[PDB]
């Protein structure tokens, strides 16, 4: 952990675009992580700061960094309904089928929160409709347990 790495973790989370910009110009570690293994990209994805996601990725951030429980920024973006961030991540090589420690995928999380547009995008980029989490569930299982009829149809 570095001085500027910490500042970047904070600025990325806070969505302070200009501070991120200046930090990028000063060489702040884009691969810094906190105790739970979240990188600046994890944070920007979680909190939905689109422009910082993009700046970070232009600046060599690991698009497929995972935290200490196996979760990637695409997991976060998909789970919290950040549609454009999800597109940018996948466009930059994010693993559409990344499994966290629970065998949970971005499709699972998006389906669970009923983010229909994000589900379609993930399917577009080749998300595995049949992947099962540790309990043997799929996105489809989630949709009918949730009683989400629209989503159930998409997953067919």
């Amino acid at each position: 952990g570095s001085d500027l790495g910490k500042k970047l973790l904070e600025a990325a989370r806070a969505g302070r675009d200009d501070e991120v910009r200046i930090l990028m110009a000063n060489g702040a570690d884009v691969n810094a992580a906190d105790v739970v293994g979240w990188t600046p990209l994890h944070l920007a994805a979680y909190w939905g700061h689109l422009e910082i996601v993009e700046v970070l990725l232009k600046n060599g951030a690991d698009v497929n960094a995972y935290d200490t429980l196996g979760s990637t920024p695409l997991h976060l973006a998909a789970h919290f309904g950040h549609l454009e961030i999800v597109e940018v991540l996948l466009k930059n090589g994010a693993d559409v089928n990344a499994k966290d420690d629970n065998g949970i995928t971005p499709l699972h999380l998006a389906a669970n929160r009923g983010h229909l547009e994000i589900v379609e995008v993930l399917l577009k980029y080749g998300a595995d409709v049949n992947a099962q989490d540790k309990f043997g569930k799929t996105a489809f299982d989630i949709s009918i347990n949730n009683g989400n009829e629209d989503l159930a149809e998409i997953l067919q």
């Binding site: 910490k6 806070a14 906190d34 105790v35 739970v36 979240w38 979680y46 935290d67 200490t68 429980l69 979760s71 966290d100 420690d101 629970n102 949970i104 989490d133 540790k134 309990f135």
Partner: protein
């Protein structure tokens, strides 16, 4: 009246003696305290939910209690915090003047009826309802110096053997333990548990069964069969008493007949109820007692009694145990009392010395001297009658009134002496004529002074309570002063004064007095010559007056305002804040660095450092700590460099270097409560369904915009805590149901192991104490540990937690705030230098009006007590000024002449302003009260000048100028006498340093500056005022 008592000196003595006995009795029985009660009454509700996160606390405890705080009288507002240490505090603040006991019982009764709606474990811990104080009389530290006791050992010893006797000590109102009594600690081992197919559920069940009180009954109980010989109680199971008994608690009998005991799956020890705080005193384990003063109690007597009680405990201390006093207001308060008594006494001396310089005979100097102790004594009696205490405010109220209270008997005596020397009349006849000249004026003056000071008693809230202390003290002294001067001094004048031959002005005397008298006789002619020339040219002086008035306004606008001077109270604070999520051990390293700094670099100043890891002011948790620094006695810290402001500045500078931690030192507020001076206290409120995240975004939007106005706003910041990573664990209901694992077993297994769980009570050496189960530390540290905890399914199989759960990181709040029952975020800040708090609050409302839909706001605390208690000042000053004018118009029987007196006001004020500005002081309460007393006396000086001038015009047909010159000639000496005594008597406060000199400087310099210009300017300007006003009308 003065007539009545001129012929009744014995009656006059009797009244004086009664007044002195009353005062003597009052001084014996009067409560002593640093400050009186000033903050509005507040009740705090505190609750604990072991192992609960902030959201859980809020949504199962805080909201439920808040929804029940209805039908309580005089509530101003309500606020709360819910945090991830499992703690909630709800604070309800009531209107000033509300009966604090009724407030508390109404709160506690509404709570009582909400208790059945709270979680069981919260009902178990109990919910405390208490009166909120922020001041301690003292803090007694208890340490162990031979390394044989942990803080838990010490805390338990204090609870068992010290607390109760202190709580019973005379004068102490409340005692708080810094730590807890022992709890029986069962530290579970998941590996051993699984080995025997046991879970924390079986542990809890076994403890409840084998540690319990069981009702039995009686042998030969009624109704008996007749002929029964014996009646005896049956005693059955009673609570366990020892760690050994707990270790032997039976959990299981295996098939080989072997036995599983609790000590086979757990480590068992006496320990603390909580482990969030680590307290150290110069690096050694510590506990302590925080002690508060009982109502109406004497702080100095209580501290002495506390120390006596402790000494009689000393013999029974285990080895290494030592008492220590890191905080004790009593020595500081001792210094204050003595200093003011010193000031009052040398004031009495100075009146003697001054009156003797001018009057030059013992009897004449004795008469004004005697009046002073009589007036002071009477004032204490009146204070006692009004139920006031001897405190910092009332004591300084008296020295602020010295000039006024001392002046009456000086004026009476000086005038009788002047009459004798000018007319030759005998003492008695002279005293009659003299009183005829001044009695009505002195009584009118009394009315005018009442009009000046009484309205100050009628401000609301906290500042009203502060001003009231001065107002009643000053009006009393002023009142007693006139009474004594109209009753006792004339009796003494008529009976004790040696006659003076007509024309005898002492100019024929030898040595010093002869020279002084001739010098002062010629100076008076010089003086009247000047006034003569001045009155030939009043135009320029009306100009010079406007210049003074303009200058006054200029200096006033630019004098920065505060409340009460900081002091070197012999202690101060150091804040330690590490980044969010920092551990208790990390914070301890910083605190150690801090403590080590003070004990080496400030070894000549610092007595001790009391490090409290885990405690913050605006949020607790493992990443916050406090270092409370106690300094050596003021006598050992010569010079400004070794006083708290310096020490603090040095410390804050040194700790700038420290890496991942914000560490800074600061002096304590005068009155632990109130304002940050130019500070405000703002609540952002969720008025709709918005939720914590949207409220946070709105807060960040408000903060960014505030930051864009450095010109108006400065240091606007959240008071609370930022969201942090937390570990979300989802139990899979289907998989639990398929494995035959119940959700209750799952959830008490998780909570009991990881959060700890209060099972029941046991008896430790005659005292009832708690029993807690919880995982030994090494099995509840990390996510991989979760899978080491097994739950027993219905069919006997042990199922690892990992089989039916899944986890992920997320963010959440470690401290949720609410305000008047709605989700909130408190924001602190202050007016930029040069700007008013009113201005800064106006902007905040403007910025707040541009926030997202559903986001509202409110003002609380110091700010609430301004948007309400600051609309008052204008109307109170107006009443004062109107009543003053009306009293004067009555005195002078004239609608215009009162103006010639009221014009004096700026003359004292300019001098006070110049002094405070030059010395770099502020416009504080002491400055302001001093302004009033300075104004009061100069008004009085003018009132007598004008009275004399007008009397000469009215009754001796003398001309305007002739009357004015004669008046001013006669008023010169008495005016110089009071001004000399008061200015000298106030000089020590001006220059003093160390203990309490902050307040002494604050009253001293304003008064000395105001008196100099008031006396120097008024003896030239009121002649002008009177002449110009008369001509105009």
């Amino acid at each position: 009246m003065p007539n009545f008592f001129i012929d009744r000196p014995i009656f006059a003595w009797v009244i004086a003696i009664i007044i002195m006995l009353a005062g003597g009795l009052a001084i014996l029985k009067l409560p002593v305290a640093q400050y009186p009660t000033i903050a509005p009454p507040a009740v705090t509700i505190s609750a604990s939910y072991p192992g609960a996160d902030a959201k859980t606390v809020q949504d199962t405890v805080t909201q439920v209690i808040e929804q029940n705080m209805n039908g309580i009288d005089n509530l101003m507002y309500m606020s709360s915090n819910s945090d991830s240490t499992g703690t909630v505090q709800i604070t309800l603040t009531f209107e000033s003047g509300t009966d604090a006991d009724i407030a508390q019982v109404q709160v506690q009764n509404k709570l009582q009826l909400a208790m059945p709606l709270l979680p069981q474990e919260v009902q178990q811990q109990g919910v405390s309802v208490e009166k909120s104080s922020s001041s301690f009389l003292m803090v007694v530290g208890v340490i162990n110096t031979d390394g044989t006791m942990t803080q838990e050992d010490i805390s338990d010893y204090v609870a068992a053997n010290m607390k109760d006797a202190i709580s019973r000590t005379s004068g102490v109102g409340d005692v708080q333990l810094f730590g807890s009594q022992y709890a029986m600690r069962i530290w579970m081992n998941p590996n051993e548990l699984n080995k025997f197919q046991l879970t924390p559920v079986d542990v809890i069940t076994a403890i409840k069964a084998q540690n319990a009180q069981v009702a039995a009954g009686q042998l030969g109980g009624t109704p008996p069969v007749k002929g029964q010989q014996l009646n005896a109680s049956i005693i059955a199971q009673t609570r366990l008493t020892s760690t050994e008994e707990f270790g032997k608690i039976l959990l299981k009998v295996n098939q080989d007949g072997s036995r599983v005991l609790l000590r086979d799956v757990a480590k068992i020890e006496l320990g603390g109820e909580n482990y969030d705080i680590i307290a150290e005193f110069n690096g050694q384990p510590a506990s302590g007692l925080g002690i508060k003063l009982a109502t109406g109690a004497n702080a100095l007597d209580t501290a002495a009694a506390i120390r006596a009680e402790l000494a009689k405990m000393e013999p029974f201390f285990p080895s290494g145990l030592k008492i220590v006093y890191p905080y004790d207001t009593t020595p500081f308060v001792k210094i204050s009392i003595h200093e003011v008594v010193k000031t009052l006494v040398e004031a009495i001396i100075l009146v003697f010395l001054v009156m003797y310089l001018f009057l030059q005979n013992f009897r004449a100097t004795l008469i004004p001297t005697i009046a002073v102790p009589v007036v002071l004594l009477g004032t204490f009696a009146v204070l006692a009658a009004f139920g006031f205490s001897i405190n910092t405010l009332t004591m300084f109220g008296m020295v602020l009134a010295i000039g006024l209270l001392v002046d009456n008997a000086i004026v009476v005596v000086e005038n009788v002496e002047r009459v004798m020397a000018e007319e030759g009349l005998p003492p008695k006849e002279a005293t009659r004529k003299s009183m005829g000249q001044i009695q009505g004026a002195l009584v009118g003056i009394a009315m005018v002074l009442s009009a000046v000071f009484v309205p100050m008693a009628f401000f609301g809230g906290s500042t009203g309570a502060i001003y009231r202390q001065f107002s009643i003290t000053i009006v009393s002294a002023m009142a007693l002063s006139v009474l004594v001067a109209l009753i006792l001094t004339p009796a003494l004048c008529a009976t004790m004064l040696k006659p003076i031959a007509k024309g005898d002005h002492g100019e024929g005397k030898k040595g010093f007095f002869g020279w002084f008298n001739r010098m002062f006789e010629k100076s008076t002619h010089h003086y009247t010559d000047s006034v003569g020339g001045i009155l030939r040219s009043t135009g320029r002086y009306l100009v010079l007056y406007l210049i003074i008035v303009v200058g006054m306004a200029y200096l006033f606008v630019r004098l920065p305002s505060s409340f009460l001077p900081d002091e070197d109270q012999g202690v101060f604070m150091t804040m330690v804040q590490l980044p969010a999520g920092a551990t208790q051990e990390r914070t301890q390293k910083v605190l150690n660095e801090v403590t080590h700094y003070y004990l080496t670099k400030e070894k000549n100043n610092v007595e001790s450092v009391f490090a409290v890891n885990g405690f913050g002011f605006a949020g607790r948790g493992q990443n916050t700590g406090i270092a409370f620094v106690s300094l050596k006695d003021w006598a050992d810290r010569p010079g400004e460099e070794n006083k708290v402001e310096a020490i603090t500045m040095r410390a804050t500078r040194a700790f700038s270097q420290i890496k991942d931690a914000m560490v800074f030192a600061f002096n304590l507020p005068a009155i632990v409560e109130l304002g940050t001076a130019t500070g405000f206290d703002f609540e952002l409120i969720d008025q709709a369904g918005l939720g914590h995240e949207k409220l946070t975004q709105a807060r960040n939007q408000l903060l960014a915009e505030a930051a864009k106005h450095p010109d108006m706003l400065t240091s606007v910041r959240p008071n609370g805590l930022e969201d942090t990573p937390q570990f979300k664990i989802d139990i899979d209901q289907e998989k639990a149901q398929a494995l035959g694992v119940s959700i209750n077993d799952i959830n008490t297994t998780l909570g009991a192991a990881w959060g700890g769980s209060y099972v029941n009570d046991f008896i430790d050496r005659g005292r009832v104490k708690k029993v807690y189960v919880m995982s030994e530390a090494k099995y509840r540290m990390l996510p991989d540990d979760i899978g080491d905890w097994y739950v027993r399914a219905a069919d006997g199989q042990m199922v690892p937690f990992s089989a039916f759960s899944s986890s992920r990181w997320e963010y959440g709040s470690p401290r949720l705030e609410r305000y008047n029952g709605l989700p909130s975020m408190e924001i602190l800040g202050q007016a930029a230098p040069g700007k008013s708090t009113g201005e800064a609050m106006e902007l905040m409302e403007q910025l707040a009006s541009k926030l997202p839909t559903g986001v509202g706001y409110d003002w609380t605390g110091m700010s609430y007590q301004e948007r309400l208690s600051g609309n008052q000042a204008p109307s109170l000053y107006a009443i004062s000024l109107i009543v003053v004018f009306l009293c004067l118009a009555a005195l002078y029987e004239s609608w215009s002449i009162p103006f010639s007196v009221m014009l004096v006001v700026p003359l004292g004020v300019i001098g006070a302003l110049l002094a405070a500005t030059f010395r770099g002081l502020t416009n504080d309460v002491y400055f302001q009260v001093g302004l009033l007393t300075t104004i009061g006396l100069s008004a009085k000086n003018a009132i007598l000048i004008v009275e004399f001038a007008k009397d000469l015009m009215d009754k001796e047909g003398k001309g305007l100028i002739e009357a004015t010159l004669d008046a001013v000639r006669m008023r010169l000496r008495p005016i110089l006498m009071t001004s000399l005594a008061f200015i000298l008597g106030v000089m020590p406060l001006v220059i003093s340093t160390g203990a309490g000199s902050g307040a002494q400087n604050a009253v001293g310099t304003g008064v000395m500056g105001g008196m100099v210009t008031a006396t120097v300017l008024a003896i030239f300007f009121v002649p002008v005022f009177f002449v110009v006003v008369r001509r105009r009308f």
